[PDB]
Amino acid sequence: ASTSQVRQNYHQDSEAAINRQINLELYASYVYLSMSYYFDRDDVALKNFAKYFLHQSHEEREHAEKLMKLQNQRGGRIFLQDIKKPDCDDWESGLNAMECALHLEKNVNQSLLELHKLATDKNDPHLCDFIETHYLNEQVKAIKELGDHVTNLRKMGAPESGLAEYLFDKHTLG
């Protein structure tokens, strides 16, 4: 029950919001793992889509680990929950997967912006700086990259053009 010897200026609500964000990052890791192996199917067979999303999956696990480290640095206590299976429809196509990833990374961003508003409301400048330094620009860059990919696939003629997704796989993802 009694207080961590390190804890200072770290609100219980911030502690709980960090636990929720840990779960969301692990969920995002799981979504990208599912998307990766869709592209490894013999009836999809886009190997650079598969490698792109597997790298994105490993990056989300790193994002979760850094928040776990933060929770202990500040003297909070990690509380884990089930990692839900990916909730998105049939992956369908390279374009549809990229659109689902864009939606995922905007939802993660909205969670981080809510977390920053809480840390601001609780006058926790260390936590605000942590979120800004390690998360907010990463999300802005991830969202911009996924928007660019969606735009190129649309302009090339995906998802009806299997030639489009094949050539995008080689020239952008390769």
Cβ of residue 92: shortest distance to a copy of itself, in angstroms?
Answer: 13
Single out the residue of 78, 107, 121, 125 in contact with Cl ion (rule: CB under 5 A): 125
CA 106 – CA 110 distance, rounded (Å): 6
157 binds Cl ion (CB under 5 A): no
Single-letter code of the amino acid located at 22: I
End-to-end Cα, the chain, rounded Å: 52
Decide which of a copy of itself, Cl ion, Fe ion, none touches 11; Cβ closer than 5 to 8 Å per partner kind. Cl ion
- 63 binds, options Mg ion, a copy of itself, Fe ion, none, Cβ within 5 to 8 A by partner type: Fe ion
C-alpha distances in angstroms, 145 versus 1, 3, 49? 45, 43, 14
> Any contact of residue 64 with Fe ion (CB under 5 A)?
no
Interface of this chain with a copy of itself, residues 60 to 99, rule: CB under 8 A: 61, 65, 68-69, 71-75, 77-78, 80-86
Longest dimension (CA), the chain: 62
- Distance in Å, CB of 142 to Mg ion, minimum: 4
CA distance 136 to 138: 5
For residue 159, whether the previous peptide bond is cis, meaning omega lies within 30 degrees of 0, is: yes
Given the rule CB under 5 A, which residues bind Cl ion?
7, 10-12, 81-82, 85, 123, 125, 137-138, 141, 144
Given the rule CB under 5 A, which residues bind Fe ion?
25, 60, 63
